Design an enzyme around this catalytic site. Structure first.
Site, short mmCIF file in Angstrom:
data_model
loop_
_atom_site.label_atom_id
_atom_site.label_comp_id
_atom_site.label_asym_id
_atom_site.label_seq_id
_atom_site.Cartn_x
_atom_site.Cartn_y
_atom_site.Cartn_z
N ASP A 146 -5.91 8.30 -0.79
CA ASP A 146 -5.51 7.28 0.22
C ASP A 146 -4.36 7.87 1.05
O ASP A 146 -3.45 8.49 0.48
CB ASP A 146 -5.13 5.95 -0.45
N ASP A 164 -15.96 -3.65 9.31
CA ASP A 164 -17.14 -3.17 8.53
C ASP A 164 -17.53 -4.19 7.45
O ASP A 164 -17.97 -3.75 6.37
CB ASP A 164 -16.87 -1.81 7.88
N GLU A 181 0.88 -1.19 0.00
CA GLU A 181 0.00 0.00 0.00
C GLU A 181 0.91 1.23 0.00
O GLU A 181 0.70 2.07 -0.83
CB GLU A 181 -0.98 -0.01 1.18
N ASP A 190 -11.18 8.71 -8.90
CA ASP A 190 -12.51 9.12 -8.36
C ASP A 190 -12.42 10.48 -7.63
O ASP A 190 -13.50 11.01 -7.28
CB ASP A 190 -13.11 7.98 -7.52
N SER A 235 -10.92 10.95 -4.64
CA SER A 235 -10.56 10.67 -3.23
C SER A 235 -9.04 10.50 -3.16
O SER A 235 -8.39 10.36 -4.21
CB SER A 235 -11.29 9.47 -2.73
N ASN A 243 -6.81 9.09 -6.11
CA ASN A 243 -7.57 8.07 -6.90
C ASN A 243 -8.30 8.80 -8.02
O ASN A 243 -8.69 9.97 -7.79
CB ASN A 243 -8.48 7.24 -5.99
N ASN A 250 -8.75 5.67 2.85
CA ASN A 250 -9.30 6.44 1.71
C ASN A 250 -10.24 7.52 2.26
O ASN A 250 -10.93 7.23 3.24
CB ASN A 250 -9.96 5.48 0.72
#
Ligand SMILES: [N]
Ligand SMILES: [N]
Ligand SMILES: [N]
Ligand SMILES: [N]
Ligand SMILES: [Pt+2]
Ligand SMILES: [Pt+2]
Ligand SMILES: [Pt+2]
Ligand SMILES: [Pt+2]
Length: 129
Positions: A52, A101, A35, A48, A50, A46, A59
């Site tokens: 990290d 989660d 990572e 999108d 967002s 990202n 994220n």
């Protein structure tokens, strides 16, 4: 701060991640490696929009607020900049929520693609716990 392989395992075992939801330490150490390359300061934008953040690349879409992810939950109630501390506490406590989660460590694509179903024991090889 770029941790060493054995250094991060210790801080990880201490902050209570070894066997956390039945994931042994090597799984967390392998995820960190693929990572962030063990760099606490790692960030990756990202497609999108967002970002990290940190040693476990948590994220901004779901988990933390960077004040620029358009439509975004802050589950973990922290600014994303507290995931970049050389003290991994905040990253660790947010990681426990994430792994709790429903999807476990599949939340980390780097874990599912590179660590899942391999001998993750090797990642804590020659470290004093
Ligand atoms: N801790
Ligand atoms: N590394
Ligand atoms: N850091
Ligand atoms: N830490
Ligand atoms: Pt640092
Ligand atoms: Pt610590
Ligand atoms: Pt802790
Ligand atoms: Pt390395």
């Amino acid at each position: 701060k770029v941790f060493g392989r054995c250094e991060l395992a210790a801080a990880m075992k201490r902050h209570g991640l070894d066997n956390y939801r039945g994931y042994s330490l090597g799984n967390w150490v392998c995820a960190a490696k693929f990572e962030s390359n063990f760099n606490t300061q790692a960030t990756n934008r990202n497609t999108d929009g967002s970002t990290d953040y940190g040693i476990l690349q948590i994220n901004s879409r779901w988990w933390c607020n960077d004040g620029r992810t358009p439509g975004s939950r802050n589950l973990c109630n922290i600014p994303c900049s507290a995931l970049l501390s050389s003290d991994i506490t905040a990253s660790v406590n947010c990681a426990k929520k994430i792994v709790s989660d429903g999807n476990g460590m599949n939340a980390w694509v780097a874990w599912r693609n590179r660590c899942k179903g391999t001998d993750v024991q090797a990642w804590i090889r020659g470290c004093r716990l």
